[PDB]
């Protein structure tokens, strides 16, 4: 069962989309694979919005990531497979965090938002 | 007492302004005693307080940012005097140092003391850092008495207060790895307490460490990187810096430095993460040591190389005759191999004749052969023996990728 | 190599050796186990013996332990190498004169190595005599 | 000749024992010369 | 290296004369065994 | 053991240096300009002294024909040969060793 | 099981020959004590 | 005081508007502050993508780079963004300044002042809403 300090956890239909958006921006470069180039997409100000893995073990490693989002104003999800959310990247090795980076002339900026402001709505 | 060290971070704020610097320098030479001893006598004392930090977490930044300052005022003041002299001396105290055994006199145009003064006064000066020192001197190094006294008097102020705050952070540096096993216990097991009150202390916090992403903390703690300066080891290993210097990694032999310290930084910053996260008093301190053990055995495996093969045997010569292809396509590719029409010829000599030769510089000895024509050697060279497009030497994969970056790294730079 | 090699205790195992690799060259080494020319060849063979493998295969016999071959070369008895297909002696024509066996060291793992190659394809061929690439013509 | 290393040989005999003589790591060619004669190879593969 | 270095500043752009410092130091090679350059300058380079 | 040369001896060769040079009243040789005059002439003459070794031989091993074929890029682009080489003037610091 | 062993010790031989050739340390972990002064000993021998 | 609250809004402003220069150079402002100190060059590089190596950009990142006291690099970049576009007054008085900081001299920029100024530009607008003449203008905002 997944950890319960990965909040917000995404639910199933929501979690597909955000993995379909994240395969999209890696096929067209806007992705950022890892919790380390998230961190740095964090820093830049380049994050749309941040997918981290709650299966995650030892989760710690991430549970940085999200004060960054909340302190920097960038919404977040973990889903709950790093296998899922690496094969979405392009990677076989288990993912942890990734970060949709920004860009106004993106085909998928559209798509990128909503799922945007789907992440928002999780969070309260 | 407690209190005083939002007003010591204001002052220091104020300070933030851009040379020139006068009346601020008088400012700033105010700030300086006032608060910049004060905060010395509170650290020696121990037990005021431990939370402190995260007050000295916010200040450091802010301290750091302020002997920045200091330096770059100087360097405005000494550079017409001295140019090259920040060029080849990176480090900010260090500068400072230089500047006042410079300034010092006596025997300086001779000898001192002058190049012992440099190795004991300026601690940190070495060998090669003073070779240079004194070419620069030898060369751009103007030694005519100071543009005024007032503006030795400046700088020697500024050296005292630059100074002053370098002792100060080094101070708190102290107080940091003294507290650290409280602080950031995984990353003191991960490292040694030493190189993780440097690391945290350059971060500001825990917090700011973490925050800052694995790749860039190898080069924390570096010495400011000068052309001049030789910099291939070894090891391979560009970053050297603090990490670097740990047991860690250089318990190992050297080839494994360069992967190990990258191994190392990661982990260091996931420990530092780790850290971040836990409330104070949980020192749990089980995952840091998951990942030294990790280390070790990364460590271990990069150490023991492959095992001898079976020594591959030659296959039985048969003597198969079994290809007969061709096709456009595959006799491009075997049109390199092939000898050309032209080398043909080239191996064809006249009979009788003192048979063509080129003397090449390096070696004479060559012999177009029957390539050239009787009337056309008579007379002189030829273009169509140089006939072939089909093997006109084509870079390969790997060169050809090189070559595009490089392309690619001049168009960034043309821009 | 002792330990690379392997070594022969019989004349009757050394021609079950001669005949029953079908496939593969036969290279024995006829030696007395202290010398240093016989030592020296046998240090070499070791190296070629992995490379050809697949093609030859290489043996030693204690020639004063093992006295049934003086038959090969009417007891001249230097520390020589002798070569085998299909229990076929097989002749590999240097300067030396001796086309039976060479009776002499050769340093160039690689030569060594050419020359089993050379005699391994006469043997193909049918050939009972080979030219050698390699002359010689030094080390009688 | 061979003297020298009698000693050391004596002293050999004397300390090891049978499981170690077991467990001698089989040795790894610690100037990596499979991947050199691969690569020569490869660049002069004629 | 750090001698020459200085030495040609006086007749290069420094630019070419550090890049001529790096050149003279790099990580030598023979049939697998090492050394590096920090010393000494290297014949071959066609500056050199 | 540190470089040989102690600082004093260093001080004494170059202010040598230094001296002579000022006699010699000598303009420093300025970085290759991003359009030099004998920009081209002399990238020419740099691929020749390259070439010379092969003019020679008939066949090439590996290595050689990498050369050889660099060569010819520069050649045939020369520009974009002679901005690479500003760059690696300018920049690169490491090398393949 | 005897000759195994020694075809293994024959490697170790080579390759610490191998290794003072390159010119890089022979430092074989689980090796026993006595062996490996052996087998210094050969290669200091071989060097001379 | 407040500039963590000014870093998020700026951020907000180039969320829904990524190219508007000037919410690049109020980022550019506040990095300078010292803050991060870091992650400098690569949001400048960043600033300059977004906005097509924008006017005002260039000139604020010179204004940085003096901020910084590395002179020559800030009088490169004012050069840069002049040249971009000239018409563009406060970038002419950073350059005076960059000029009077240096051993320089003035007689270049005056011959090539023959081009317009309070245009556009902030800093100058404001000098004019506070006049008629224009190097009276630049000497008041020199001092």
């Known amino acids: 069962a997944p950890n319960p300090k990965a909040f917000p956890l995404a639910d199933a239909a929501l979690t597909q989309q955000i993995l379909d958006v994240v395969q999209q921006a890696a096929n ?54 790093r296998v899922a959310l690496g094969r979405a990247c392009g990677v076989s090795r288990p993912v942890i965090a990734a970060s949709i980076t920004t860009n106004d002339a993106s085909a998928i900026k559209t798509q990128i938002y909503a799922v945007k402001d789907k992440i928002e709505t999780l969070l309260i | 007492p407690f209190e005083i060290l939002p007003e010591s971070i204001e002052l220091f704020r104020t300070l933030a302004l851009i040379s020139p610097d006068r009346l601020s320098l008088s400012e700033t030479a105010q700030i300086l005693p006032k608060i910049v001893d004060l905060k ?43 140019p090259e002299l920040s060029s080849l001396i990176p480090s900010p105290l260090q500068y400072s140092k230089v500047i006042s055994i410079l300034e010092n006199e006596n025997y300086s145009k001779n000898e001192s003391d002058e190049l012992f003064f440099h190795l004991e006064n300026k601690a940190k000066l070495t060998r090669e850092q003073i070779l240079v020192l004194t070419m620069s001197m030898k060369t751009s190094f103007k030694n005519k008495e100071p543009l005024d006294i007032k503006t030795r008097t400046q700088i020697l102020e500024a050296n005292s207060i630059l100074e002053n705050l ?77 990490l670097f210097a740990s047991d860690m990694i250089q318990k190992f032999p050297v080839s494994v430095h360069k992967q190990m310290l990258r191994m190392l930084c990661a982990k260091v910053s996931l420990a530092a993460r780790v850290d971040a996260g836990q409330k104070n008093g949980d020192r749990n301190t089980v995952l840091a040591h998951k990942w030294k053990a990790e280390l070790s055995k990364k460590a271990r495996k990069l150490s023991e190389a492959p095992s001898i093969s079976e020594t591959k045997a030659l296959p039985i010569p048969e003597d198969q005759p079994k290809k007969k292809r061709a096709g456009r396509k595959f006799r491009k590719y075997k049109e390199k191999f092939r000898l050309s029409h032209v080398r043909q010829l080239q191996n064809r000599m006249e009979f009788g004749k003192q048979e063509q030769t080129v003397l090449d510089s390096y070696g004479e000895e060559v012999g177009l052969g029957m390539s050239n024509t009787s009337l056309q050697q008579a007379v002189g060279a030829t273009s169509g023996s140089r006939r072939s497009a089909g093997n006109q030497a084509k870079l390969t994969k790997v060169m050809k990728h090189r070559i595009s970056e490089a392309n690619q790294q001049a168009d960034e730079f043309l821009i | 190599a002792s330990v690379l090699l392997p070594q022969l205790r019989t004349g009757w195992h050394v021609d079950q050796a001669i005949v029953t690799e079908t496939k593969r060259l036969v290279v024995i080494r006829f030696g007395r186990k202290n010398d240093r020319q016989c030592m020296i060849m046998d240090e070499l063979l070791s190296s070629i013996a992995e490379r050809v493998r697949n093609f030859a295969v290489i043996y030693l016999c204690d020639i004063d332990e093992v006295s049934d071959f003086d038959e090969m070369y009417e007891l001249t008895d230097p520390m020589t190498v002798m070569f085998f297909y299909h229990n076929k002696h097989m002749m590999c024509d240097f300067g030396t004169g001796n086309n039976n066996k060479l009776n002499f060291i050769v340093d160039d793992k690689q030569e060594m190595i050419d020359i089993l190659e050379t005699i391994f394809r006469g043997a193909r061929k049918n050939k009972g005599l080979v030219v050698s690439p390699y002359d010689y013509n030094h080390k009688r | 000749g061979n003297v020298d290393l009698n000693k050391l040989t004596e002293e050999r005999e004397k300390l090891l024992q049978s499981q170690i003589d077991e467990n001698l790591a089989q040795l790894t060619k610690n100037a990596s010369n499979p991947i050199q004669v691969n690569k020569p190879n490869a660049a002069t593969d004629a | 290296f750090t001698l020459l270095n200085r030495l040609l500043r006086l007749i290069v ?15 030598i090679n023979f049939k697998d065994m090492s050394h590096v350059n920090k010393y000494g300058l290297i014949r071959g380079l066609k500056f050199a | 053991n540190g470089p040989e040369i102690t600082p004093e001896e260093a001080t004494t060769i170059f202010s040598v240096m230094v001296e002579w040079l000022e006699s010699r009243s000598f303009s420093p040789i300025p970085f290759p300009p991003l359009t030099y005059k004998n920009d081209t002439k002399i990238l020419v003459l740099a691929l020749e002294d390259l070439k010379d070794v092969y003019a020679s031989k008939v066949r090439l091993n590996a290595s050689e024909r990498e050369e050889l074929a660099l060569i010819e890029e520069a050649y045939d682009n020369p520009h974009d040969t002679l901005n690479r080489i500003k760059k690696y003037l300018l920049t690169q610091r490491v090398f393949k060793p | 099981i005897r000759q ?39 290669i200091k021998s071989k060097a001379d | 005081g407040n500039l963590d609250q000014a870093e998020l809004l700026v951020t907000q402003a180039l969320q829904k508007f990524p190219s508007n220069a000037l919410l690049w150079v109020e980022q550019i402002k506040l990095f300078k502050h010292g803050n991060k100190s870091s992650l400098k060059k690569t949001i400048f590089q960043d600033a300059l993508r977004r906005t097509q190596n924008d006017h005002r950009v260039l000139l604020e990142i010179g204004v940085s780079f003096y901020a910084e006291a590395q002179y020559e690099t800030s009088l490169k970049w004012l050069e840069r963004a002049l040249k971009k576009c000239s018409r563009y007054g406060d970038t002419w008085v950073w350059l005076f300044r960059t000029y009077a900081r240096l051993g320089k001299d003035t007689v270049d920029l005056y011959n090539m002042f023959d081009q317009c100024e309070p245009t556009y530009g902030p800093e100058w607008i404001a000098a004019s809403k506070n006049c008629t003449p224009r190097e009276i203008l630049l000497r008041l905002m020199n001092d």
């Open chain 1, 28 to 81: 067209l470069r806007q992705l950022k694979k890892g919790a380390n180039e998230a961190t740095k997409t964090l820093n830049r100000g380049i994050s749309e919005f941040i997918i981290m893995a709650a299966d995650c073990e030892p989760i710690e490693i991430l549970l940085h990531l999200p004060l960054l989002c909340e302190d920097k104003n960038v919404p977040y999800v973990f889903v709950p497979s």
């Open chain 2, 40 to 82: 010395r006598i509170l650290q020696q004392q121990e037990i005021d307080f431990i939370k402190l930090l995260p007050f000295f977490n916010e200040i450091i930044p802010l301290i750091k940012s302020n002997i920045k300052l200091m330096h770059n005022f100087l360097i405005s003041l000494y550079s017409r005097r001295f």
């Open chain 2, 166 to 242: 370098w002792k100060l952070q080094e101070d708190i540096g102290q107080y940091i790895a003294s507290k650290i096993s409280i602080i950031a216990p995984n990353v003191c097991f991960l490292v040694g307490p030493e190189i993780a009150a440097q690391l945290i202390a350059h971060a500001g916090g825990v917090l700011e460490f973490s925050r800052i992403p694995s790749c860039n903390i190898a080069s924390i703690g570096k010495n400011k990187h000068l052309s001049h300066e030789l910099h291939t080891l070894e090891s391979g290993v560009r970053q050297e810096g603090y």
């Open chain 5, 13 to 27: 752009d420094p630019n070419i004369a550090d890049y001529i410092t790096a050149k003279n130091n790099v990580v």
């Open chain 7, 4 to 42: 195994k062993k020694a075809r293994t010790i024959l490697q170790h031989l080579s390759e610490a020959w191998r290794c003072w050739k390159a010119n890089i340390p022979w430092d074989v972990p689980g090796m026993p004590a006595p062996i490996k002064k052996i087998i210094e000993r050969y």
